[PDB]
């Protein structure tokens, strides 16, 4: 992931939070369908 460190964003129906150096994200594991 290229993201703003510590920002919240969405992948489909999932909440993601960007890691401390903006290179990855942890996201919720909902089934969106």
């Amino acid at each position: 992931s290229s993201c703003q460190p510590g920002t919240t964003f969405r992948r489909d129906c999932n909440t993601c939070v960007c890691n401390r150096d903006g290179t990855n994200a942890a996201c919720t594991l909902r089934a969106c369908l």
Side-chain angles (χ1 to χ4, degrees):
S1 185
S2 169
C3 52
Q4 287 288 52
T7 67
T8 298
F9 66 98
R10 279 166 78 90
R11 289 177 186 163
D12 302 335
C13 75
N14 284 119
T15 306
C16 301
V17 173
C18 189
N19 72 0
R20 209 185 159 77
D21 66 358
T23 65
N24 224 307
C27 307
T28 55
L29 299 168
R30 302 173 186 120
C32 302
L33 291 162

